[PDB]
Design a protein around this ligand. Structure first.
Ligand SMILES: *O[C@H]1[C@@H](O)[C@H](n2cnc3c(N)ncnc32)O[C@@H]1COP(=O)(O)OP(=O)(O)OP(=O)(O)OC[C@H]1O[C@@H](n2c[n+](C)c3c(=O)[nH]c(N)nc32)[C@H](O)[C@@H]1O
Ligand SMILES: [Mg+2]
Lengths: 45, 100, 729
RNA sequence: AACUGAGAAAGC
RNA sequence: AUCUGCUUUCUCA
């Protein structure tokens, strides 16, 4: 399905990755240190 | 916004709310709606419920200090007072400038 | 791999060009950059493939361990290219590499192939568990119809199927939860749980799901079988000259069985009415009729539905009549009533005049839809009353809408304000009532707006309702809500023991529609149930084969040669109104040819089949006169008395008879004097030739003028373009 | 330096 | 009662 949206691809990718990382952390898939690394990378992004 | 809503709903195993909400609470594992009115808060709360009913919690704030939260009291009164004061300040400034 | 994806995103943002591409490009514009291509693609893939196959390494490998399993060279055959150019170059392999993988490569798991291509496996199962009848060589009239390519168990509109696929495979980035996400929640959940343990590419799974759900409908030439299980074999089912009997495997929906049964009964009745003792012939044909793979009698017994034709055939066969009707989602049972259908130039709300089918007379139906029931009393284009029982809101609304459409209420017609198409893009006639039903099912607001509301009933039990599906103070006009053996005549008329006709052959719908399943007639005269062109061609072929005997009897006999089974079947496609006039005209022409020495063999063949029905001469005792004898079905199905016709043309030069596109030869059955013989004596009944075009007589006289001439009065007749003659009575 | 529209088919 | 996502090939225009 074609992705719609007037916002930047970077914005959509960053928000999607942030949500995925938060879900992985809450569900326990990702370790706490890995979640910290992900959050740092997203912040610098 | 819809991606965030659907991701949270799938993770917490709750049926997707049929309308886009305002916030999602992990502690409550639910959704929170914000409707900023100017008259009675209870009337607008009932209007929102008539279409939502039990989909998610509803929080109503009015510039006249009148408010209406959901059946669960989660936020402490400090934040509610701060929000009401902010709304009152905005309303007073708008009325002073003849913008209200 | 959320962390890995985030690291990849940071790495990509470390590149300025990629950074600006991601920042500037919007989500919608992604679809543009996904198609970015600096070098134009080549446009001769067949030549390119033939060129590449004659090379070393045309195929491209996928970097990984599996590509490493492929040896660099096998028995002196270099399967894959050398790996000394790894740097930002890529890898390639030969087709011999593919063959080596198929020969000695690792043995993988086939479950993914079974899952993804389950549709094709079901197709193969249907083919294998199928039986083939006999191939029949003869004319076949194929009609181009929009038919479903492949069978489906749950067919949904493309957007609904796309939403279902998004929910199943992409629950998170699915967007707004739509109506489809709810009404197909069970299927979505079942597919998600079934697909939970799968590592197949999501796009491949989406295409599998759409193949399972989305319906592919194409215009194809069909002949008596339009069910998808038959459409997938259409290539083997029949052609323009042959027909293969096919019995597909798998289970068939009873809706197709009912539709095919209705078509079969209608064909049987249409072929029987013209026959002498129609009841006997109808029973004989119905006892040898098979719907796909079951006899017609069993289908009639086991199907709780049908139409007038099905009831007539049931009575003829001894089964009870099920006076039931289907109008889409609405199922009705005729409690009592009587009405004769007519074509009326109904004016639609949007100023469209349509020849809609209108019924007249009081009629009461026990109606039902979904889980709701009711009683609908109606008259000509009016809903007298509709007493509905309490049920679900949506079911009740559907029942009310369908009953409104069925009653053909004038307000219902005036309630159409929008785009409604009663003619398909190919010009074929869509059913007007069903199109109105489809329009009103969705855009139902205007129907209730124009229907009008009256006071709700105050009776003990009767309480009315409104558009909200609640017992409101105001009810829909004529709508109320409440909480609470036959014999068949020779002519196929159903009569109660009292002596009242309840249904007759004349009440059978004249529509000729392709059967959903393949109807077979296990009788020697199975072509007599064919279409107009098939019947015409078969009758004329029979005439040609027996031409010698027919002509000998005509010269010797007087009236016994006009009665034959082939001509009886041919009569079934001549309209009853014109059948007698055609018989009189053709018989007069043939007798006038015989009595004189003018015997045009082509005209004898042309007019002989029409000499079956009892003559119906004019009030003065002289036969009617015709220029073309119009046959039932289609505008081009007619026989030209003088000129050639699409169904019948003669070429004297080659003596070749082109009937329905098939060329027979009269060489051998002809007299060389016939070519010199004049066509003017075999054109008008009771008219002979006297001379050439006479200016004194006047201009060519038309049929109306010709019929009014007196004996011995000459006139100008134009046999065809460039051929005028002078005829006398 | 392989365009436009329509139809069918295949692949993603 | 069937009508109400693109790419490539071939044909037609
Ligand atoms: O597929 C066609 C037809 O064969 C099929 N059909 C008709 N009846 C059934 C049943 N009972 N089961 C399964 N399929 C059925 O639907 C298509 C209808 O095509 P056609 O044969 O042209 O229909 P017809 O010419 O009879 O007119 P139509 O309006 O479609 O009605 C068909 C059916 O409904 C009866 N009917 C409709 N209306 C509005 C009626 C009415 O006002 N009064 C009475 N007494 N009957 C009405 C028709 O008579 C048929 O019974
Ligand atoms: Mg909002």
């Amino acid at each position: 399905r074609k992705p719609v949206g007037q916002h930047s691809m970077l914005e959509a990718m960053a928000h999607r990755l942030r949500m995925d990382a938060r879900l992985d952390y809450e569900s326990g898939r990702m370790s706490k240190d890995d979640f910290e690394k992900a959050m740092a990378h997203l912040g610098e992004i | 916004a819809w991606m965030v809503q659907r991701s949270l709903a799938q993770e917490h195993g709750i049926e997707t709310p049929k309308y886009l909400a305002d916030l999602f609470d992990y502690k409550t594992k639910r959704f929170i709606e914000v409707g900023i009115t100017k008259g009675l808060a209870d009337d607008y709360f009932w209007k929102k419920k008539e279409k939502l009913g039990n989909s998610m919690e509803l929080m109503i704030f009015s510039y006249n200090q009148d408010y209406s939260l959901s059946n669960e009291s989660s936020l402490d009164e400090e934040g509610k007072g701060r929000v009401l004061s902010r709304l009152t300040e905005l309303q007073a400034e708008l009325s002073l400038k003849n913008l209200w | 791999m959320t962390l890995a994806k985030i690291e990849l995103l940071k790495q990509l943002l470390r590149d300025n060009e990629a950074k600006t591409v991601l920042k500037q490009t919007t989500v919608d514009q992604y679809n543009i950059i996904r198609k970015f291509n600096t070098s134009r693609i080549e446009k001769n893939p067949s030549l390119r493939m033939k060129w590449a196959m004659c090379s070393n390494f045309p195929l491209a490998l996928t970097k990984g361990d599996m590509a490493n399993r492929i040896p660099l060279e096998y028995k002196g055959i270099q399967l894959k290219t050398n790996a000394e150019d790894i740097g930002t170059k890529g890898q390639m392999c030969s087709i011999a590499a593919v063959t080596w993988w198929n020969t000695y490569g690792p043995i993988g798991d086939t479950e993914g192939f079974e899952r993804v291509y389950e549709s094709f496996f079901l197709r193969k199962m249907r083919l294998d568990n199928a039986t083939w009848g006999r191939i029949t060589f003869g004319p076949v009239e194929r009609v181009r119809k929009r038919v479903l390519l492949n069978p489906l168990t749950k067919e949904m509109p493309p957007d609904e199927a796309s939403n279902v696929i998004m929910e199943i495979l992409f629950p998170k980035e699915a967007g707004i939860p739509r109506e489809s996400t709810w009404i197909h929640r069970e299927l979505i959940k079942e597919k998600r749980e079934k697909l939970k343990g799968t590592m197949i590419t999501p796009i491949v799974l989406a295409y599998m799901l759409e193949r399972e759900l989305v319906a592919r409908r194409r215009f194809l030439p069909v002949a008596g079988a339009t069910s998808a299980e038959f459409i997938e074999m259409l290539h083997c089912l029949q052609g323009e000259n042959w027909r293969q009997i096919y019995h597909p495997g798998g289970n068939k929906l009873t809706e197709s069985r009912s539709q095919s049964m209705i078509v079969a009964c209608r064909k049987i009745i249409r072929r029987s009415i013209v026959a002498s003792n129609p009841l006997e012939l109808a029973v004989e044909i119905a006892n040898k009729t098979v719907i796909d793979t079951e006899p017609l009698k069993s289908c009639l017994a086991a199907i709780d539905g049908g139409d007038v034709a099905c009831d007539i055939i049931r009575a003829a066969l001894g089964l009870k009549i099920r006076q039931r009707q289907r109008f889409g989602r609405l199922e009705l049972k005729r409690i009592s009533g009587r009405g004769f259908k007519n074509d009326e130039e109904i004016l639609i709300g949007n100023g469209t005049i349509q020849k809609i089918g209108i019924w007249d007379g009081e009629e009461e139906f026990h109606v039902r839809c979904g889980e709701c029931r009711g009683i609908l009393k109606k008259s000509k284009m009016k809903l007298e009353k509709l007493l509905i029982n309490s049920a679900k809101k949506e079911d009740m609304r559907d029942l009310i809408i369908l009953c409104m459409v069925f009653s053909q209420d004038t307000r219902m017609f005036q309630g159409v304000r929008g785009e409604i198409n009663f003619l398909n893009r190919a010009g074929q006639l869509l059913s007007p009532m069903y199109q109105l039903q489809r329009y009103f099912l969705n855009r139902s607001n205007d129907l209730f707006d124009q229907w009008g509301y009256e006071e709700s009933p105050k009776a003990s039990e009767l309480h009315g309702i409104n558009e909200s599906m609640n017992a409101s103070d105001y009810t829909l006009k004529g709508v109320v809500v409440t909480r609470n053996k036959v014999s068949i005549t020779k002519n196929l008329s159903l009569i109660k023991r009292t002596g009242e006709v309840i249904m007759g052959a004349n009440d059978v719908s004249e529509l000729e529609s392709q059967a959903q399943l393949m109807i077979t007639y296990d009788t020697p005269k199975m072509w007599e149930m064919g279409t107009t062109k098939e019947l015409v061609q078969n009758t004329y072929q029979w005439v040609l084969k027996n031409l010698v005997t027919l002509k000998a009897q005509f010269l010797l006999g007087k009236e016994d040669m006009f009665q034959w089974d082939a001509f009886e079947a041919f009569e079934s496609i001549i309209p009853q109104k014109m059948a007698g006039q055609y018989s009189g005209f053709a018989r007069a022409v043939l007798k006038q040819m015989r009595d004189q020495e003018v015997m045009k063999t082509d005209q004898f063949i042309k007019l002989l089949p029409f000499c079956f029905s009892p003559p119906k001469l004019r009030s003065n005792g002289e036969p009617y006169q015709f220029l073309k004898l119009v046959l039932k079905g289609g505008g081009e199905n007619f026989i030209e008395v003088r000129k050639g016709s699409p169904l019948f043309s003669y070429n004297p030069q080659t003596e070749v008879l082109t009937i329905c596109g098939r060329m027979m030869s009269l060489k051998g059955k002809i007299e060389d004097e016939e070519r010199n013989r004049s066509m003017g004596n075999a054109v008008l009944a009771g008219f002979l030739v006297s001379g050439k075009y006479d200016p004194d007589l006047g201009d060519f006289k038309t049929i109306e003028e010709l019929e009014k001439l007196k004996p011995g009065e000459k006139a100008n007749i134009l046999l065809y373009q460039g051929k005028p003659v002078k005829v006398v009575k």
